[PDB]
Design a protein around this ligand. Structure first.
Ligand SMILES: NC(=O)c1ccc[n+]([C@@H]2O[C@H](COP(=O)([O-])OP(=O)(O)OC[C@H]3O[C@@H](n4cnc5c(N)ncnc54)[C@H](OP(=O)(O)O)[C@@H]3O)[C@@H](O)[C@H]2O)c1
Ligand SMILES: NC(=O)c1ccc[n+]([C@@H]2O[C@H](COP(=O)([O-])OP(=O)(O)OC[C@H]3O[C@@H](n4cnc5c(N)ncnc54)[C@H](OP(=O)(O)O)[C@@H]3O)[C@@H](O)[C@H]2O)c1
Lengths: 481, 481, 481, 481
């Protein structure tokens, strides 16, 4: 398999040391395309996690004390190494998580861009001087690393989730203990390996593998951890925020979404269809910003449905390492069951399957890209994140009406719409209750803009100048002359 | 009492209406100097709070839709009214909370400044344009009001605590339901009255008085509330943050502090003493940023102690309405009990009373300005928040030792130090784990600088350009050409 | 006359004293509507200007040394006084410059807004801290007043031109010597009077009246003057910039414009006509941002021309003090002469007058609002600033053609266009070589956005956070630990 | 000689082509250490410069149209190449300009950092959105490249002067025509060569060699050039600013300095001496920020003078290619003469040579580091830029006195002072009329902070987030809904 075999790691990284769990237990990792065992990863608990936090704390003063340029040098080394080893990293990711190799290569590039961006940002952590309240007073604001930080990351973007958190943390001058998804830990550990090679000192970046709560409970209850960042389900987000209350930790969360994708009568339809295909079926729909509800205005509903159906039959389901495959398997059978459930629920409420609608002939974790039409506003899918390759099409008549429908949810991460009228664009863009709004495009991803949710969708922002804020503390100094 | 009798309110403000509780129950409010009943306020519960939230929700679109200048006009009217009625407002505050009239006048001025500052800041909510990731993409960031907000405020700064939250909320384009302290609600309600007179529309700013549980539980559990701001004890902060997890609310907290006040060998000792007197004994020590631990270097310990004792003998205890009174009573008998406990604890651990030491001859809520020496680091008085006119005094050797001692706490709000050497000032200023650092000054309060805590001391900042951020949501728009 | 007779001043203000010229010579000021003498102002020269500069220099340390808040108090007093005396100030302006009373009241309000805006901005002059290049280095940037400043202002906006320069100068902590237009000096002197009443100290703001080059030569050659701001003709801009080279003065310039006004096929035509009317005929076309060239796409040319002609009928010419008058006289005979020359030049090159086109029946400085068609691109009116009620109409074919035509000029001040298509709006908005671009609106004026030109049109910006920059010097401080 | 022989170029670079002058005339370049001919560069004039401007103009749309990241990729390649070829570039520079090899290597590294920094800054050109003046208005500010730019650079920092201007220009999206110093053109042309290798397209960066005004007259009179940046003498700065007035060009200037270096009673003397040695004798005192006047307080004057004299023994004069040489030759005989003239005027006015005092035994351009004492304020050296290894020592009594003396000059570039007292540091730091202030350090150079002068010392800033502003135009767009 790999050009560089040392990128494949079956041990956790704590304080510069590759280690097994104290008790020797491991978690098996399997290939979602076929069920084959790829390897394993330590099943760590509180004790190893505690040791990792103590290592992060011990390494903090010396990391914090480096110049921004010397941190930038190390981080840029990390970035360069990621790009150098791109092919191996992509292969590793396809094997453990399932997405097509081209998608995985794209993710490596995107993931790496966070390391580069924040290396640069670290040199631009600006304080302020503020005109004084009295002639004999001087006011200075500085921004300093929050300290030891914890990160919990999901399985759907096994590389980019890491770098979206480690990038700003390390560039801020913080240290980090990261717990990657048990289903896709290899990508995280490979990045850890490249961090060593880049010159990241022992204890500055630690990767601890184990079962959800064992590691997580220690991360949220240890007062040395001053900041937690989590990406995943809304329910676990709730529990983690509750747990963080004891120490009044600063918490960043990127949670559930239920993205509306809105096509107005004045849209460029071919572009809407391309946007919809890219937005819905990226990572087989296993994305927090995937179109989950497709609202199409009555004037263009029939034409759009036809074009979308034409475009969808062109997708190739298969093993993500094979030529021309554009839809891989879902992560597990639990993901499949949810897609199945959403389809059944839409049917019981009067929707019609136009195409797909069932598990793929391959079985296992493979599901057919599917289109539902005549989907009513009371359907589960209208309220609940699908996380799979299902396009449900909601009809609409009126702009005010669709805005009300789009916003009628506790979530508020990404939304998309297609329209050409300037005034319409402003009205809809402004009225949508979402943290991210794609306008005439289905692909919004980059490292330079703030990515995050409002409402039940989360707290804080990732990427951009705003992204590093969450890892800093403001200090106000008032000097008496 | 008052020049304008209509400033004294004994009813809550909901949706522009002055109301009693539905069940007509009231909370009595007494004068802490003597125990006299001043009046009462409604004892509202979930029902009235719910109705207030619904009013704030209803009022939000039209408030949000005003220009920043028209919001500024209304807020500047409120500011001007506060300053016009300064004398009445100060009197009202002295009567209900106890502080000397001059301190109350000072607080009105400071409280009002937040309204003015944020009126101005509202016009300066700047979005961004960011260079695109592709030639056919445009990136725009806008900042919009988070929506309906809740505020819970304490008794120690009965006017400033209101304006530090209502100012940025309203200027951001949010609406607000505020629950003021049951011991000092009149200040809040007078401000409410002036908000009506200023042109603040019905439902934009609501003040609900009642039991903490009954009002607070509704604030934290109603999903229409998207943001909570609280100032008070660390334990209630923990509970409120837990409760906010359900809706993933944005939370601002300003909590406990245990402020170290550090005097180095090279300090101006007369200035250090002045700063210590101002910092420790302001509001009789009932301040979240009050000096709570006095660290004085070996070389100057004896001289500082002598000078401090000279300066303190000049302190005058009495009714806050009387000439020359500089120490008023504490807020209630439990305030006294805590101070008494901290003394008892330090003595049992081998400390010495240098002056004060017990409850004043007047009795009731009055307490003797107290200094302790020979206090060990594990004493209640040096680990917990005292909120009384009691200071332990510590000797230290050098820079390294005192920094370690200063930072050896779960808190992180304010710290102070006195030194003249430039290098020392940077070293100590940077090393202190506090959100606020006073350097050669004991008074750091203003509206223009970010005020808040790190660690267990809070989340978010109040005042300054950063203050309004906590009430805004960032929206990223990506336009496809 | 006036409600407050002391607003009418016939003396200059130097160092808090109302003075005549040393030689007692005066400049007569006449009413452009009828030629009546209104009064006179001192005809000052180098001597009095030098004394004004010395007074500004002398007052600088104490003005600079005030807190931002105390400068804000004084400037807000000035703002408030301007609004209080709005009616008198508007009357005074209509009498001396000619514009309709409603336009003059509008200008007072707009002029005043600069004083308020900058009073606020003075409190928000932010320095920086920058991460250091070495561990033992600290980098701090502060912004300080440039020092003594000079302002030269034109006759077309006799109040707003003052406040757009004095506002940011005084808020920055600078002092100022201002030379107003000889044709409209009363508005400037009234403002000066209000500055006294507001608490602006002697020598902080001085108004010297006199003949262009005598006062100007002293302003540009005196090394105590560190900054010059000028609004007027391009040719005088060139000369003043040349003169400022000796001392390497910081120079702000707002110069000539030749504003294209572009109407696309997909425009809302009624809104385009309304915008065109407002943009072209405001201040009788005597505005640096007035539509000077009207480009209308082939598909809508005929309809637009018809509608514009209908709308122009409801403009009423007369004395600006009379009810319903919407076009006053031009400033003088020379202005009438330039409009006649533009029309004559157009006609001899094949142009055709649609309506108007001759001096008004009243004579003097009154001119008929005029539409010209068949105007060649080599016509004086398509190349030069007209500053009169003259609307030439240009046909166009496609977007790329009109952009090339709009940009084919040395000027680059304001441009306007009307379109509904989102992509078109971006393409055109981005490609126009102008400092200010109105999109689907003819009225772009406010204090909060940066106003200024590119190319031969000027240097620097007025209004906004960028406006105060031109009156500050950046100071970089590098501290060695 | 060089590792990479193609770095040594004897032709100009215009539109991607290496060219001789139209008339084949060349300028000889000699080694200042011995007078040897190194080679020559074209003696170009108006015609070639005009062709270069046309080439820059032609290349602008496609350079402007790239994404910020693709410009960053090209610029980072340039940076990397500079660091890769550091040894050759350093050698080339030492040969043509004379400075020690270690100084030259340091300049290459410093010069390269501007290219890196601005590559990063280009991705961070932020526009704004501003809250509207009316509910139906939206305000957007964008920042766009100013267009074709011209740069004129001096001989003292033959690499860093180029990159300080080309860096921000190209990162802004501008194109550039650069005229390097005729005495040190090879460094510029080598950088040009690496720009080709980096992927900088033809016409984006042009280097035209020629003698002063020939090239300069065309740069300043050609209206396609919209921005000029110049570093050199004050007198040429004045002339260039005058010439730029015709087109109202945006002008950046870094001119003469006369840096005061102030040592207070409470300074660390050994550190002051080290700082003074580094500040005064870097590049043999041929730097715009070199200490030119040494003010030492009465209490420490004698001790400082003794220590400075001891330290001046650590200076080793010779060929910059030889081991341990720390002072090279001056640039030419005219430089030697000016130093001899300053010493003579100082002695004529009563000053005394403590050490050195005349040309170095080698002759040619070699001069002895000199200390003067007993220097009066009327000496030329107190008013004029020496640009040579001459340290004059002034005695001062107190703070107010030295501040007044320091500021008593038309210059305002760099100043330095040594003091430990916090209050003193603020007082003096704030009161100094300089763009750059070193505090307890003699070395202030970096790419992250704004570098530039006030008063007659310049316009604009180089390095930092501010550095790019001078190369952008602000565009205000106002959208009507
Ligand atoms: N991009 C996203 O915002 C995102 C990502 C993933 C899932 N989801 C949503 O969640 C749904 C299904 O849930 P899921 O199982 O994939 O995600 P989940 O339960 O929210 O878990 C996400 C990650 O958090 C860890 N985790 C769970 N509970 C924890 C705890 N108490 N303490 C510490 N860590 C804990 C898990 O670790 P283990 O791997 O060890 O179990 C997992 O890697 C999906 O269908 C999707 O809608 C969203
Ligand atoms: N860092 C600085 O601010 C700096 C730098 C250099 C000099 N100086 C000052 O000037 C003195 C040295 O004299 P200098 O002859 O080197 O100074 P200068 O006359 O200002 O020359 C500086 C550079 O600008 C070029 N130049 C001069 N006039 C020009 C014009 N009209 N158009 C276009 N380019 C023009 C020259 O090119 P050519 O080589 O082709 O003649 C030279 O390389 C020093 O003693 C110092 O005080 C200061």
């Amino acid at each position: 398999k790999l050009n560089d075999s040392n990128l494949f790691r079956q041990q956790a990284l704590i304080n510069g040391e590759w280690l097994d769990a104290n008790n020797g237990e491991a978690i098996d990792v399997t290939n979602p395309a076929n069920g084959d065992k790829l390897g394993s990863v330590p099943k760590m608990g509180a004790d190893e996690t505690r040791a990792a936090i103590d290592a992060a704390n011990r390494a903090l003063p010396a990391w914090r004390a480096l110049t921004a340029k010397e941190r930038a040098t190390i981080l840029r080394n990390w970035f360069n190494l990621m790009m150098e080893h791109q092919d191996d990293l992509a292969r590793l990711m396809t094997l453990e998580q399932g997405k097509p190799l081209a998608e995985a290569k794209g993710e490596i590039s995107y993931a790496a861009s966070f390391i580069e961006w924040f290396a640069e940002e670290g040199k631009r952590i600006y304080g302020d001087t503020i005109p004084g309240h009295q002639a004999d007073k001087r006011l200075i604001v500085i921004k300093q690393p929050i300290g030891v930080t914890a990160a919990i990351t999901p399985w759907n973007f096994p590389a980019a989730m890491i770098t979206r958190k480690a990038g700003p943390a390390l560039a801020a001058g913080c240290t980090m203990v990261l717990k990657p998804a048990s289903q896709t830990p290899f990508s995280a550990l490979a990045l850890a390996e490249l961090a060593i090679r880049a010159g990241v000192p022992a204890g500055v970046f630690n990767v601890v593998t184990g079962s959800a709560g064992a590691v997580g409970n220690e991360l949220t209850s240890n007062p040395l951890v001053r900041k937690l960042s989590f990406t995943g389900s809304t329910e676990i987000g709730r529990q983690l925020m509750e747990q963080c209350a004891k120490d009044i930790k600063k918490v960043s969360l990127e949670l559930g979404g239920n993205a509306p994708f809105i096509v107005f009568d004045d849209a460029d339809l071919d572009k809407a269809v391309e946007g919809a295909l890219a937005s819905k079926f990226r990572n087989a729909g296993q994305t927090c910003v995937c179109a989950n509800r497709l609202y199409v205005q009555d004037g263009v509903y029939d034409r759009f449905a036809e074009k979308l159906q034409q475009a969808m039959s062109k997708l190739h389901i298969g093993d993500g390492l094979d030529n021309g495959v554009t839809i891989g398997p879902l992560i597990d059978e639990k993901a499949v069951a949810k897609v199945e459930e959403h389809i059944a629920d839409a049917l019981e409420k009067g929707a019609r399957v136009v195409c797909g609608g069932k598990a793929h002939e391959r079985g296992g974790n493979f599901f057919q890209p599917t289109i539902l039409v005549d989907v009513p506003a009371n359907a589960k899918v209208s309220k609940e994140e699908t996380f799979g390759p299902l396009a449900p099409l909601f009809r609409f008549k009126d702009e005010a009406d669709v805005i009300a429908q789009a916003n009628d949810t506790e979530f508020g991460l990404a939304a998309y719409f297609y329209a050409r009228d300037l005034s319409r664009v402003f009205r809809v863009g402004e009225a949508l209750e979402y943290g991210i709004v794609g306008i005439n495009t289905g692909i919004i991803s980059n490292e330079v803009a703030p990515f995050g949710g409002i409402k039940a969708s989360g707290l804080g922002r990732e990427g951009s100048k705003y992204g590093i804020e969450d890892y800093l503390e403001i200090k106000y100094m008032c000097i008496g002359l």
